Amino acid sequence: VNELNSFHVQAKVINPNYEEVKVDVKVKFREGLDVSFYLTKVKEDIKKFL
Amino acid sequence: SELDLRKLFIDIEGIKNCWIKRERVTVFADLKNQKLSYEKTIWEDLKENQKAQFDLKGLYRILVETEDADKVLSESLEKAVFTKFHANRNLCEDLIKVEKVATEPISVCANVEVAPEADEELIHAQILIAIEDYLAPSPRHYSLKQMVDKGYTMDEIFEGPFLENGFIDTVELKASELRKEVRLSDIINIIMSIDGVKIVKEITLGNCDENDGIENNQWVICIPENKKPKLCKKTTINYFKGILPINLNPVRVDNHKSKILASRLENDLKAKDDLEPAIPQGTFADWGEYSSIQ
Amino acid sequence: SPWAYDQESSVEFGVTLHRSQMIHYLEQLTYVDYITDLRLLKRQAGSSPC
Amino acid sequence: MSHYRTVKEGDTLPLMTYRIYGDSKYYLEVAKANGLTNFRRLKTGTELIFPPLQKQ
Amino acid sequence: QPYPSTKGKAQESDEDYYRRVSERLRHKKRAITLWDYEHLILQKFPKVYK
Amino acid sequence: QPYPSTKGKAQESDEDYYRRVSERLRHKKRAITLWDYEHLILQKFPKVYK
Amino acid sequence: DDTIERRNQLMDHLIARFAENFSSYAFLMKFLYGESTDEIVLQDKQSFLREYKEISRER
Amino acid sequence: ITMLEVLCYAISDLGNRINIPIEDLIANEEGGVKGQFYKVQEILPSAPT
Numbered sequence: 001v002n003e004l005n006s007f008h009v010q011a012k013v014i015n016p017n018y019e020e021v022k023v024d025v026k027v028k029f030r031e032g033l034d035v036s037f038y039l040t041k042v043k044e045d046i047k048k049f050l
Numbered sequence: 051s052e053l054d055l056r057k058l059f060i061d062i063e064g065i066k067n068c069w070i071k072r073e074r075v076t077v078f079a080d081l082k083n084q085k086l087s088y089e090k091t092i093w094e095d096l097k098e099n100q101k102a103q104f105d106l107k108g109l110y111r112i113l114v115e116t117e118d119a120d121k122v123l124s125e126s127l128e129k130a131v132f133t134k135f136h137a138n139r140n141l142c143e144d145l146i147k148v149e150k151v152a153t154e155p156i157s158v159c160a161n162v163e164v165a166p167e168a169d170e171e172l173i174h175a176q177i178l179i180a181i182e183d184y185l186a187p188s189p190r191h192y193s194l195k196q197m198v199d200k201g202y203t204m205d206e207i208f209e210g211p212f213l214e215n216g217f218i219d220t221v222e223l224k225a226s227e228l229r230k231e232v233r234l235s236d237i238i239n240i241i242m243s244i245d246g247v248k249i250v251k252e253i254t255l256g257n258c259d260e261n262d263g264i265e266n267n268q269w270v271i272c273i274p275e276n277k278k279p280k281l282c283k284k285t286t287i288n289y290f291k292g293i294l295p296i297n298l299n300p301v302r303v304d305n306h307k308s309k310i311l312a313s314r315l316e317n318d319l320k321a322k323d324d325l326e327p328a329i330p331q332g333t334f335a336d337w338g339e340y341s342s343i344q
Numbered sequence: 345s346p347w348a349y350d351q352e353s354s355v356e357f358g359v360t361l362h363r364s365q366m367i368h369y370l371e372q373l374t375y376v377d378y379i380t381d382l383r384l385l386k387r388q389a390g391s392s393p394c
Numbered sequence: 395m396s397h398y399r400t401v402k403e404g405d406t407l408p409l410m411t412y413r414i415y416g417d418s419k420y421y422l423e424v425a426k427a428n429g430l431t432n433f434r435r436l437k438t439g440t441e442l443i444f445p446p447l448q449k450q
Numbered sequence: 451q452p453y454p455s456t457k458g459k460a461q462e463s464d465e466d467y468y469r470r471v472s473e474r475l476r477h478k479k480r481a482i483t484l485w486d487y488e489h490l491i492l493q494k495f496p497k498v499y500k
Numbered sequence: 501q502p503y504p505s506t507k508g509k510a511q512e513s514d515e516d517y518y519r520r521v522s523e524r525l526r527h528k529k530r531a532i533t534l535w536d537y538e539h540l541i542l543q544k545f546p547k548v549y550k
Numbered sequence: 551d552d553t554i555e556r557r558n559q560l561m562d563h564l565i566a567r568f569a570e571n572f573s574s575y576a577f578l579m580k581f582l583y584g585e586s587t588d589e590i591v592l593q594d595k596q597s598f599l600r601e602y603k604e605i606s607r608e609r
Numbered sequence: 610i611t612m613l614e615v616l617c618y619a620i621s622d623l624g625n626r627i628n629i630p631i632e633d634l635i636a637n638e639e640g641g642v643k644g645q646f647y648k649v650q651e652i653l654p655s656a657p658t
Contacts, residue, residue: 001490004481006140007052007070008108011487051480167576209479235377238363239370250363269379291577339432350549522569526606528655533609603647607656 020050054210056223058138059112061215062130066115066188067226071276073109073146078102108143110135113151115186115278123150154273155282156185156232157262160241161252163290168246170289171298175306177247177287180240185279187226190314191216193324204327216321228278232271251290258282397444401436414444459496509546554588561595568602 002010023046031037052070059068078093079086079102086092093101112131114123131148139145158181164173192200197207197217207217234255241250255268273279289296346353355368362381369375387394397414407425408418425433428442462470470493477486491498512520520543527536541548565572572595579587598605635645642648 001481001487004051004479004490007055007110008072008143166573205474205479233377235366235370238366242363242367249361251361253363267380270377294577296577335431337431341432341435522567525567525652526569528607528653530655530658532658603651607654609656 053220053223057213057218058134058211059114059131060189060218061213062127062134064117064124064127066117067186068115069113069151069228071111071113073106073111075106075109077104077106079104110143110145112145112148113276114148115151115188121150123148151228152277153280154277155258156271156279157256157258157282158237158285159252159254159256159287160250161288161290162241162247163249163251163292165246165248166291168291170296171302172306173244173246174287174289174298175303175310176244177241178303179307179310180244181237182281184236184240185229185232185281187222189218189222189226191218191318191321193217193321194326195324196321214322214325216318216325228273228276230273230275232273232279234267234269258284395446399442399444401438401440401442403438405436405438407433407436415447554592557592558595561592561599564599565595568606570598572598 005011027039028037028042031039031042055070056068059065075088077086077088078090080092080096080100081102082096082100112135114127114131116123116127118124128148132145135145162177164170193216194207197219200219210220232255234253237255238250238253241247241253255271256262256265257268257271289298345351347358354371355364357364362383365381365383366378369378399410408421411421411424412418421433424442424444427445473489473493477489479490481487481490523539523543527539529540531537531540562572572591575587575591575594579591583590635642637643
């Protein structure tokens with residue numbers, strides 16, 4: 001990029017240095033089963049979405 | 051961009067090369083009484099922790115190398131450079147000065163043995179040109195057909211500003227930057243590669259200067275930051291065959307050097323004709339004509 | 345060694361000026377420059393008498 | 395082999411193709427080899443070519 | 451074979467061909483504004499997600 | 501076979517044939533001057549290098 | 551017909567057949583004559599071939 | 610085409626003479642090889658040393 005910008009400008013390239021908040025919630029009113037749709041499975045799905 | 055500007059100005063007739071440098075205008079300030087000036091007088095009667103300086107961020111200086119070999123630029127060139135700059139400029143940037151590039155003189159002295167069946171006037175003309183090209187290279191213009199033969203595609207050939215005089219290769223342009231240091235290991239290779247040269251028996255470099263008495267070999271010579279190196283014209287090569295020195299007619303060398311140069315001028319001028327690709331052409335014939343099925 | 349005994353060598357002779365040695369090295373695909381060189385006889389060869 | 399004719403008034407392209415090849419179905423290849431767009435009306439001075447069929 | 455293979459690239463699809471040509475016709479291969487910088491990098495560096 | 505073979509010789513090339521005939525026509529198989537001595541030995545003794 | 555260059559090539563070949571060599575005339579004659587050396591040198595090379603039978607024998 | 614065939618015929622004639630053996634191509638009107646070669650009786654013997 002610095003070759004394509006302008007004689008007067010240099011850009012810096014960095015990592016995002018990630019930081020983030022996380023969810024908690026009221027229990028689901030329904031689930032396929034205590035195991036098949038365990039709260040842990042829901043947690044895994046939530047993690048994948050994020 | 052910087053390379054675009056070099057391509058922009060290098061097409062003004064009479065200019066062989068250009069370099070773009072940045073001005074550093076300094077402003078001083080009083081932090082006790084907010085006040086600023088270009089003078090350090092702004093700091094009179096202040097304490098050490100009440101002082102500041104800032105440098106300006108968007109100003110240019112243009113260094114020009116011309117064909118003329120005069121002392122100054124013609125005013126017609128200064129008008130051409132200022133005109134193109136202002137006509138085509140970036141937001142929040144400006145041009146302060148256009149001037150001719152400064153130089154640094156270098157001496158080369160040597161004893162060179164050549165083949166017993168060799169044209170010495172031609173060898174001299176060839177060595178001499180090759181050293182000059184090493185010290186200060188310049189780009190050449192190409193036809194579209196040539197850019198294609200080199201392996202470039204359309205996206206690349208037309209990447210920058212369109213140039214009326216032929217195409218300029220970015221690699222050559224980047225290579226032709228002001229040289230910082232001069233070294234013996236390159237000069238020797240230039241001489242040894244000339245057909246007919248057998249042995250360089252003596253060779254030395256040195257800053258061209260007066261009272262050039264006993265001094266160090268200067269295997270590498272460094273050049274100040276805004277100068278172009280140039281042979282000092284006090285240079286010399288003694289040519290030998292076996293153990294006998296030979297004398298070269300002064301005039302004939304000029305003829306060989308001229309002819310070698312003559313070709314470059316002819317070739318650049320050839321480039322104006324081939325500046326665009328073909329587009330396929332069709333005919334015209336009322337494609338909607340219809341006859342009844344009756 | 346190619347002068348002392350048969351081997352390949354581009355240079356005309358080992359018994360030559362530094363200019364020939366410089367050209368031989370400059371031709372290498374893995375070199376750029378060298379500030380200085382010398383080749384005096386080994387006055388400091390202890391094995392063969394001083 | 396190759397053949398040429400001149401168009402007379404009363405000629406149609408599928409009838410001429412039948413008398414030269416033995417089949418009326420080649421009329422769109424004869425029209426493409428002559429650059430004809432409005433082949434359903436032929437003008438009565440045109441000279442056409444009739445190329446041979448390919449062998450392999 | 452412990453780790454995944456790397457550095458390969460498939461031939462351009464029609465969708466990518468059109469995408470690449472269309473952007474060059476707009477940004478002119480210069481890095482001036484935001485869109486320019488972000489699209490020049492995603493086109494040039496294939497293993498950048500955002 | 502612990503060691504390389506020895507004492508063989510290939511058939512003369514055209515280049516060697518011309519070289520050998522040409523020299524005899526000048527030195528006349530006599531050892532008088534420098535060139536004579538040096539070329540008589542290199543032609544006669546095949547495993548001398550210089 | 552570039553006679554001077556072509557005539558020299560023929561003469562040099564014939565001289566080489568006897569393992570002889572006249573390369574040094576190319577420059578030594580320039581200390582004696584100017585442009586006229588080209589004619590002089592070709593005459594000398596022809597004379598050398600004619601006289602060769604005795605030259606190489608009665609050393 | 611007629612002209613081409615005539616020229617091809619002429620070329621064959623030239624090639625055929627080029628292949629005439631050396632003994633004839635450099636022969637003298639009076640026989641011998643006086644200006645062409647030195648003979649073994651003249652060029653091989655050596656002065657006695």
